[PDB]
Structure formats: C-alpha cells, structure tokens
Write an enzyme that holds these catalytic residues in place. Structure first.
Site, PDB file in Angstrom:
ATOM      1  CG  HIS A 104      -0.437   0.457   2.526  1.00  0.00           C
ATOM      2  ND1 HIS A 104      -0.111  -0.402   3.557  1.00  0.00           N
ATOM      3  CD2 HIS A 104      -0.195   1.718   2.991  1.00  0.00           C
ATOM      4  CE1 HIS A 104       0.300   0.301   4.607  1.00  0.00           C
ATOM      5  NE2 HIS A 104       0.262   1.597   4.279  1.00  0.00           N
ATOM      6  CD  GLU A 164      17.866   9.748   7.371  1.00  0.00           C
ATOM      7  OE1 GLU A 164      18.777  10.144   8.145  1.00  0.00           O
ATOM      8  OE2 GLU A 164      17.610  10.425   6.348  1.00  0.00           O
ATOM      9  CG  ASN A 200      17.838  13.803  13.276  1.00  0.00           C
ATOM     10  OD1 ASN A 200      17.135  14.406  12.463  1.00  0.00           O
ATOM     11  ND2 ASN A 200      18.071  14.289  14.516  1.00  0.00           N
ATOM     12  CD  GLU A 208      20.657  16.722  14.000  1.00  0.00           C
ATOM     13  OE1 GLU A 208      21.463  15.766  14.189  1.00  0.00           O
ATOM     14  OE2 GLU A 208      20.325  17.527  14.872  1.00  0.00           O
ATOM     15  CD  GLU A 235      21.774  11.319  10.623  1.00  0.00           C
ATOM     16  OE1 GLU A 235      20.908  10.542  10.210  1.00  0.00           O
ATOM     17  OE2 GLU A 235      21.552  12.577  10.570  1.00  0.00           O
ATOM     18  CD  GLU A 268      22.528  10.747   6.552  1.00  0.00           C
ATOM     19  OE1 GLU A 268      23.753  10.834   6.266  1.00  0.00           O
ATOM     20  OE2 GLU A 268      21.989  11.506   7.399  1.00  0.00           O
ATOM     21  CG  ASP A 306      -0.006  -3.781   2.834  1.00  0.00           C
ATOM     22  OD1 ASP A 306       0.464  -3.363   1.769  1.00  0.00           O
ATOM     23  OD2 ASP A 306      -0.293  -3.076   3.853  1.00  0.00           O
ATOM     24  N   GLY A 342       2.756   6.163   8.556  1.00  0.00           N
ATOM     25  CA  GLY A 342       4.117   6.473   8.209  1.00  0.00           C
ATOM     26  C   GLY A 342       5.075   5.326   8.501  1.00  0.00           C
ATOM     27  CB  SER A 347       2.933   1.348   6.102  1.00  0.00           C
ATOM     28  OG  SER A 347       1.717   1.423   6.755  1.00  0.00           O
ATOM     29  N   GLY A 348       5.435  -0.720   6.045  1.00  0.00           N
ATOM     30  CA  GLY A 348       6.517  -1.176   5.204  1.00  0.00           C
ATOM     31  C   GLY A 348       7.750  -1.484   5.994  1.00  0.00           C
TER      32      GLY A 348
HETATM   33  C1  LIG Z   1       0.654   2.814   5.046  1.00  0.00           C
HETATM   34  C2  LIG Z   1       1.010   2.588   6.548  1.00  0.00           C
HETATM   35  O1  LIG Z   1       1.782   3.687   6.987  1.00  0.00           O
HETATM   36  C3  LIG Z   1      -0.208   2.538   7.515  1.00  0.00           C
HETATM   37  C4  LIG Z   1       0.219   1.955   8.857  1.00  0.00           C
HETATM   38  C5  LIG Z   1      -0.862   2.108   9.982  1.00  0.00           C
HETATM   39  C6  LIG Z   1      -0.568   1.152  11.121  1.00  0.00           C
HETATM   40  N1  LIG Z   1      -1.569   1.408  12.173  1.00  0.00           N
HETATM   41  C7  LIG Z   1      -1.403   0.838  13.469  1.00  0.00           C
HETATM   42  N2  LIG Z   1      -2.383   1.192  14.405  1.00  0.00           N
HETATM   43  N3  LIG Z   1      -0.419  -0.017  13.730  1.00  0.00           N
HETATM   44  N4  LIG Z   1      -1.257   1.699   6.971  1.00  0.00           N
HETATM   45  C8  LIG Z   1      -2.402   2.229   6.453  1.00  0.00           C
HETATM   46  O2  LIG Z   1      -2.588   3.454   6.421  1.00  0.00           O
HETATM   47  C9  LIG Z   1      -3.411   1.255   5.888  1.00  0.00           C
HETATM   48  C10 LIG Z   1      -3.460   1.198   4.447  1.00  0.00           C
HETATM   49  C11 LIG Z   1      -4.639   2.219   4.035  1.00  0.00           C
HETATM   50  C12 LIG Z   1      -5.585   2.155   5.054  1.00  0.00           C
HETATM   51  N5  LIG Z   1      -4.782   1.738   6.279  1.00  0.00           N
HETATM   52  C13 LIG Z   1      -5.178   1.784   7.593  1.00  0.00           C
HETATM   53  O3  LIG Z   1      -4.370   1.443   8.473  1.00  0.00           O
HETATM   54  C14 LIG Z   1      -6.527   2.300   7.910  1.00  0.00           C
HETATM   55  N6  LIG Z   1      -6.450   2.959   9.222  1.00  0.00           N
HETATM   56  C15 LIG Z   1      -7.559   1.157   7.864  1.00  0.00           C
HETATM   57  C16 LIG Z   1      -8.984   1.702   8.058  1.00  0.00           C
HETATM   58  C17 LIG Z   1      -9.487   1.697   9.341  1.00  0.00           C
HETATM   59  C18 LIG Z   1     -10.763   2.221   9.604  1.00  0.00           C
HETATM   60  C19 LIG Z   1     -11.473   2.779   8.530  1.00  0.00           C
HETATM   61  C20 LIG Z   1     -10.938   2.817   7.246  1.00  0.00           C
HETATM   62  C21 LIG Z   1      -9.676   2.274   6.999  1.00  0.00           C
HETATM   63 CA   LIG Z   2      20.038  12.072   8.563  1.00  0.00          CA
END
Ligand SMILES: *C[C@@](*)(O)[C@H](CCCNC(N)=[NH2+])NC(=O)[C@@H]1CCCN1C(=O)[C@H](N)Cc1ccccc1
Ligand SMILES: [Ca+2]
Lengths: 235, 51
Positions: free
Chosen positions: A41, A55, A57, A60, A62, A65, A89, A183, A185-186
C-alpha cells in the site's frame, strides 16, 4: 511509532525510509544490496520513489546515509485482488545502484517459512520507523523503536470488525498506548534470535493508533519468504 | 530438535538415530562445534556491529 524510544545510530541497520511526493511516507527493510521489502500500500501508484538507507535523524546529516532510486516495484501478485482488505500487503523495490554494506547499512535475515513462523511465535518482536509519534500527530525526527507482544488470534478477531486473514497477525498491548502508526508501514517487525535479527512481519494497518482494545496488524512474512527469495536473487 | 532447537543456534533438522543437523542462514557458516553460527562475511545479515 507511538510510545516507543529513540534508536541509537546503527541499532536497526536494515531499516530504510521511503521518500517521494510525500517525505518519509513509509519504511522498508534491506533484503540485500539491490532489494528492499516494504508494504504494497506504500507503492501502489508507480510514481517515483527514493530510498534512504543508513538514516537516523531525518532533519540532520549523519554522513551514513545512502540514497538510491527505485527502478522496479513488485507488489505481491495477490495484493488488491480484493478491494480494501489489505491482504498480501507486501512489495519489493529494486534499487538503481547497489547499497554499500557497512555497520549502518546491513540486511535483515530471512529464514524459511517454518523458522520464520517459529521466530514469530516466540511472541516478542521489535517494530521501528519514522511514522507518527501520536495518533494524528507529527512524524518522528529520530528513528523510533518498540517491542510489541504477539496477540492471540481470538483476541485479535474480537478487537475489530475487519477480517484478520491467515496472512496477518496482531501485536500490541491490551492497555494500548504503544503501537506502530501512520508512516511506519513497510518497516520491519523483527525477532532477535541469539543476537541475529530475522524478519517476522511488515508493518501494515490498524484502526487509529495505540487505542486501548485495538492492535497493530502486520503482514505475516512467513507466508511470503519463498516469493521474497525468488524475486530478489542476485546474479 | 524438540527441546531447545537441538542446541542449534539457528536451524535444526531431525536425522536418523534421533540425531540432529544444525545449519545457518546466508552470511554465516556452521561452526566447529556443529551447533553455533559464525559470520562468514564482513556484514552478515541481522547483526548490530556499530554498538
Ligand atoms: C501505510 C502505513 O503507513 C499505515 C500503517 C498504519 C498502522 N496502524 C497501526 N495502528 N499499527 N497503513 C495504512 O494506512 C493502511 C493502508 C490504508 C488504510 N490503512 C489503515 O491502516 C486504515 N487505518 C484502515 C482503516 C481503518 C478504519 C477505517 C478505514 C480504513
Ligand atoms: Ca540524517
């Protein structure tokens, strides 16, 4: 990451950050000098992405990087076969030029399917990233990390109206307060085995962040290790 | 492999006469003691070396 702590430089040398039309929009992990694993995603569009390894900071310098361009993106072939389920995902990014491995730029280990699952079930893993440090709040400057407990499948099923597929697991605290977040994710969920870290999950999705009664949802890497190893071969 | 992974630091496989064979991931080699894993490259995966 909500409720975590500052990493030290080189503590998670497999961690990378992704930059593009948004700065620091997702994390990833080094598979080898040419390949990053992240969440599908994060990279749905095919728009231009850069990777920064070494990476720490993000405001900044380092002098550790290493910046690379992404020349190929391979989302898992079953990602988005169903709409908005977040199943499968996971994605792989090929770099234009190899990373130079050193103490700040080091791959994560990836076991076979059996042992990745064994390591997950040990039941304690680390997540890391530059995502939000509060729900709906600012992103981190210094890389954050957090130990999260594995949560039993029945509990996780009850925590949400969503489907939790076999290709997912849940991790976090019954009282809330500590979680991955937007932020992150991944980035990696990793399990340390006698001083050697193994990739056990990909930070994937949730409902808000760090809410009591909710858990972070993670892609179960054991189900994808054959595909990762197939696609990231060096020759 | 049943108890404590057969004493294998990383991976264990069962073998005849109820013995075990240990192994390690890429970047490591099985050590002399046939259990431990030692680095075989300058920056093996999964290791913190800044410290
Ligand atoms: C892309 C990643 O940064 C992010 C990680 C979020 C992790 N959350 C926790 N509590 N550990 N993932 C997302 O943003 C994913 C993919 C797109 C939607 N999504 C969600 O996490 C939504 N919050 C899912 C959702 C919940 C309620 C209603 C609608 C969608
Ligand atoms: Ca840096």
């Amino acid at each position: 990451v909500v409720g975590g702590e500052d990493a030290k430089p080189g503590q998670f040398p497999w961690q990378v950050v992704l930059n593009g039309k948004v700065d620091a929009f997702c994390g990833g992990s080094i598979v080898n000098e040419k390949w990053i694993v992240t969440a599908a995603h994060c990279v749905e569009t095919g728009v231009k992405i850069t990777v920064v390894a070494g990476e720490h900071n993000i405001e900044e310098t380092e002098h550790t990087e290493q910046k690379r361009n992404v020349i190929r993106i391979i989302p898992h072939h079953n990602y988005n076969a169903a709409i908005n389920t977040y199943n499968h995902d996971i994605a792989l990014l090929e770099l234009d030029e190899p990373l130079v491995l050193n103490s700040y730029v080091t791959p994560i280990c990836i076991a076979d399917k059996e042992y990745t699952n064994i390591f997950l079930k040990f039941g304690s893993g680390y997540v890391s990233g530059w995502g939000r440090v509060f729900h709906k709040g600012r992103s981190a400057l210094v890389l954050q990390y957090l130990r999260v407990p594995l949560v039993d499948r029945a509990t996780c099923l009850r925590s949400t109206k969503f489907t939790i597929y076999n290709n997912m697991f849940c991790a976090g605290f019954h009282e809330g307060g500590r979680d991955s977040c937007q932020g992150d994710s991944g980035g990696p969920h990793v399990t340390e085995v006698e001083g050697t870290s193994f990739l056990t999950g990909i930070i994937s999705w949730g409902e808000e962040c760090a809410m009591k009664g909710k858990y972070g949802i993670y892609t179960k890497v054991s189900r994808y290790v054959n595909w990762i190893k197939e696609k990231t071969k060096l020759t | 492999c049943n108890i404590k992974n057969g004493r294998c630091e990383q991976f264990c496989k069962n073998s005849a006469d109820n013995k075990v064979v240990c192994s390690c991931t890429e970047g490591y080699r099985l050590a002399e003691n046939q259990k431990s894993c030692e680095p075989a490259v300058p920056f093996p995966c999964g290791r913190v070396s800044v410290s």
